[PDB]
Design a binder for these strands. Sequence first.
RNA 1: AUAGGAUAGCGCAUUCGGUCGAAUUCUUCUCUGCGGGAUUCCUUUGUAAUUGCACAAGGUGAAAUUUUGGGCAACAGCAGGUCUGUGAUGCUCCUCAAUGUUCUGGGCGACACGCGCACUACAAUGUCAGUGAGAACAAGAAAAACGAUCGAACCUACUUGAUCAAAAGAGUGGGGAAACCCCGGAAUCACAUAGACCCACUUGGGACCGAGGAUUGCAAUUAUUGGUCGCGCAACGAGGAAUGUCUCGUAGGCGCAGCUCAUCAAACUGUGCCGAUUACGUCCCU
Lengths: 144, 71, 101, 183, 82, 66, 152, 134
Amino acid sequence: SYALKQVQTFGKKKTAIAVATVTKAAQCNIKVNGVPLQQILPDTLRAKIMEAITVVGSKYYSRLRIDVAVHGGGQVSQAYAARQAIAKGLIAFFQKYHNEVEKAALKDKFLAYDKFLLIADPRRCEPKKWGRHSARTRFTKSYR
Amino acid sequence: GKIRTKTVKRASRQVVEKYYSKLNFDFYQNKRVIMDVTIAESKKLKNKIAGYTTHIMKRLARGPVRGISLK
Amino acid sequence: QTVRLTITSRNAKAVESVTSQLLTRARDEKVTIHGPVRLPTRTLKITTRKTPCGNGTNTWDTFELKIYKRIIDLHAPTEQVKKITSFTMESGVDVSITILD
Amino acid sequence: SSKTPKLFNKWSFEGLETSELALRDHISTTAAYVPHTSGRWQKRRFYKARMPIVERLANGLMFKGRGNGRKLQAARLLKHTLEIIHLLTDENPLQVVVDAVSKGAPREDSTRVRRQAVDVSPMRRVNEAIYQMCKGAREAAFRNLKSMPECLADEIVNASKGSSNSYAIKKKDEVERVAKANR
Amino acid sequence: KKWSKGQSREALQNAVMFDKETYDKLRSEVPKYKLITPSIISDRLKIAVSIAAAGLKQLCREKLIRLVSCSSKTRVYTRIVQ
Amino acid sequence: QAQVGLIIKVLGRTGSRGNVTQVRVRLMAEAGSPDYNRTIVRNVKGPCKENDMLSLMETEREARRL
Amino acid sequence: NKIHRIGKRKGATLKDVSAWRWIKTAARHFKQEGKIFVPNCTEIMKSSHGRERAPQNPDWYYIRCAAVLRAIYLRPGVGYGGLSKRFGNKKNYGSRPEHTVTSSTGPLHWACKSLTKLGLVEPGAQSGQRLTRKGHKFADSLAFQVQIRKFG
Amino acid sequence: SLTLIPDHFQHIVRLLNTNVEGKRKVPFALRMVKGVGIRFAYLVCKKAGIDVERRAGTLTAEELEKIAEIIADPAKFKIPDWFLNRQRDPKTGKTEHLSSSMVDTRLRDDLERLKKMRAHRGVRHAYGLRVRGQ
RNA sequence: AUAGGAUAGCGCAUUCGGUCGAAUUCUUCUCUGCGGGAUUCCUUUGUAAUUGCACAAGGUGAAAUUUUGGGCAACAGCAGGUCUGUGAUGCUCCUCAAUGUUCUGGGCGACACGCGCACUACAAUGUCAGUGAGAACAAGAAAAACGAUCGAACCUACUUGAUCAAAAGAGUGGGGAAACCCCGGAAUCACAUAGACCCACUUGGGACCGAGGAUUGCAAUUAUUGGUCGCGCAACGAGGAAUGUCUCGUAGGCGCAGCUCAUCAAACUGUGCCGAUUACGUCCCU
Ligand SMILES: [K+]
Ligand SMILES: [K+]
Ligand SMILES: [Mg+2]
Ligand SMILES: [Mg+2]
Ligand SMILES: [Mg+2]
Ligand SMILES: [Mg+2]
Ligand SMILES: [Mg+2]
Ligand SMILES: [Mg+2]
Ligand SMILES: [Mg+2]
Ligand SMILES: [Mg+2]
Ligand SMILES: [Mg+2]
Ligand SMILES: [Mg+2]
Ligand SMILES: [Mg+2]
Ligand SMILES: [Mg+2]
Ligand SMILES: [Mg+2]
Ligand SMILES: [Mg+2]
Ligand SMILES: [Mg+2]
Ligand code: NA
Ligand code: NA
Ligand code: NA
């Protein structure tokens, strides 16, 4: 009988919310919405999600099973939310089950590469105003 | 720009004149003191008053400040 | 049996006062309480042109109406539930009683 | 176990530098896996100089109504362009891109009504090189059998060698020649 | 009216089918190119891109050229080393 | 053919429309050269800043002060 | 080395392999067996009224049946209306702005009928369509073949 | 398709008094004749047993005759009535498919029919104006 | 693999919202009524001060300067618009074959032409045919009638039509709306799909028109609106002089809902999605 080691994190980008469940398992197994990492398309978005592993190194994910459920947003914002949840999930796991010297070298490595790997981007859609066709574009003016 | 209006400056000068002994060079403790010695709706105004109140205290250490009368 | 109280109003202050009053009275009865759930606030939106004649810049007025809803579940008989919700409710607050199954 | 990024897991950033003494602090050689990031680059004046150079090239392909906002499409086009550049030159396509950006914009211009010769700031030299190379490739591939990744690769390779066959080099010479007249 | 000139061009004639002369050049001249693309082969052999791309797939299947960059809409080939 | 100069002081936005910046640039030359530590005033088109670098081509013309 | 099991991991289920590879392999299996029912209307009709041309793949019905079987696996209890959203497209309306149209439920109803005859799909309790035990077995067994690089 | 060009290849193929281009694919070369669209041409190839990936210049004389006879009488080759461009002729009541010059001839008859009865749609056609309420 | 590259894993192997199986525990994600949080707060051998009020870089931070976007917004005015919103109104006009009010038909849509604002395009950064993964704001049914306190109007899922096109047409169930729709399978987008096309007014474009059929309505002719097959041999290959809007989740692109609505969005009001270039200035033009 062994204790269950598990943490839960979230990553956000626009309206996309990703929830990652990081569990200590027999082997590393990361899936996004039930899809394995190598089955995620396009390859450009797969590389963005894989940054949460390659930046610190795959040795820190050695026996972690990560399940990421992403809802809302679109094709790209879901990928950015998913990689933030995975990167934040590793930090939370090391914060709960490891010491502080680790999870600090990992945290500095993540923030040296991209702040948005751990910190949510606050940007959101600006509301449309009447007399405008979008947030800023005003109606076409004619003079004669 | 960040200019303190006469509403904030007048209130800050009143706060220092009456609670000089309880004020400090730290915004966060001064904000706590100002919260229960002033009545106002705006949390933003209280925060602005705490910012200028701390500014006056730093000026008072270096010398006299015009408009402030410590008896 | 489970009795559900639905509290709906236009005024947020009134809907919170009535909900807290029901919670306090139910606590005095030592009945099982399923905490007051804050249902999503619904906004009714009507956007109309300001002018009454269609002259000038097409300026608009956005009118909004917010509806607040709360639910409380009571594990009490209808007789006990009835006398719990028997105080002077604030005006503009609608309390409905239903029996769950 | 962590390793340095390689663009498209193929091209290494090791030793990436510009031969131009200027533009050294305005051409970013930071290693990246793909030319896609969601950074808030246009928030301060000179922050765009820190954006990786290939991503800046990708942003230059998102033009006209039918190309606006297609950053994944631009990333795919660049992936094929770099392979064609490697076959054409037998060098690292990242270095070829840096060389093309290094010399793809005039160092002297004429402004203002009598025109007067002025010098070009390093930020504008990098901006103009990317703008001109992408504009030339886009127009070269418009009603053409050749696809853009071939047209873009030809434009970059020619500009990296300073050849007049590139649109960017031709425009640079004409501007600098006119600036010499307006001295 | 007529605010633009248009700059009319010359309509190229590209064969939609291979003949013996063009097929032989594809199997002999093409595998010597450093950069191989359906657009490039179409220009040298005066053939349509559709049949040029089909010819390149036959060469790649025969291990006469190698696939460098592949996508749904883009294929890049190069000559076999040695 | 092109001498590299370093911007050491931004003097202001000159001309109409403010699209040209006048700066003082120090010529970066090896010690012992005649142009060592030679400062000149030039007009710059585009976003520029202190400690930026310029390719000056010719280094004889000096921009009029404004 | 390309098909070797990663490590300590064995077998494969659906959602573990390429979605297109499974659909292409399932369509090939349906055609090779020759037991699936193919309506004659599939040789003349369009997959939806939102399209402007008929399908260019002669085996488009087998692919559609395979894709529908995968869709039922992922969303048990789905009906023809739910499948219609998945196979919709943007219809061209000429000089008017274009709009999204759900796919025609006719071919989808036929596709579920063909899969029901094969025993892979049964009507779910309280509405919808669901995979049978054989249908679930067929999907996961074929996914392993895709991972093994068999492809029929 | 890597098939060598035959000696009998034709760049212009004559079919139902229309100059069909031989360099085109078979379904997209059959849509050059009047009355045959993209949807109809694919069915014609299917009913004639002609691979749609071929070029029309490679078609044999017997292949063209099979194509020509299918276009003339599509219903005989199990082409449904709802697929035809004249399903219940207002003059004869018979389902047919107009092709080649008969498409223009029937259109002239349709215009003349409405003009003779002095219908509103016929009057608009004679005056050279729009007839669909535009 | 038909030719099969690149791309994490190397005490207990993964998967199944129909397995509509149970149980137990819980609040990371969702809901929200009051709170907290940011202010020039901290630091410069910065600017300036030579008091001050402040400013510029960086730090801290979810957010760093009116935090972002809106709403509100003084005093004086214009003979600006509305007497076509009202049972808001002075004067004036008509008032029984009426300028009142109903009913029938027609018109408000009529085209040598000119102008404003949109929509769709001129294609390969493409069009077709497939396949994948995937938003948000929102809407939904009735009387002091009519039928036996509800049930029928409204929106929908599923099934059926189907032993053979679409659009339909039916049956059953649910939803008063965080409960059903709904795990809201939107479209830009993605695909190593080994797919078709190959630079041409062409499989670009889809105006114009022909024939069948269905649907809304008391009524469709002057096509109400969908769907099918023809027509595409209509202009259009990037647009002269001029000219509009816009600084970050912005422009542009992309769809969706609401609103008008029995039927009909190229409009508007909102919503989310993909996401840039340039500037960080000046008073040359207005
Ligand atoms: K005034
Ligand atoms: K001015
Ligand atoms: Mg005027
Ligand atoms: Mg289109
Ligand atoms: Mg459109
Ligand atoms: Mg006034
Ligand atoms: Mg007036
Ligand atoms: Mg009046
Ligand atoms: Mg009125
Ligand atoms: Mg009157
Ligand atoms: Mg009368
Ligand atoms: Mg009108
Ligand atoms: Mg006008
Ligand atoms: Mg595209
Ligand atoms: Mg054209
Ligand atoms: Mg203007
Ligand atoms: Mg309107
Ligand atoms: Na307007
Ligand atoms: Na106002
Ligand atoms: Na049509």
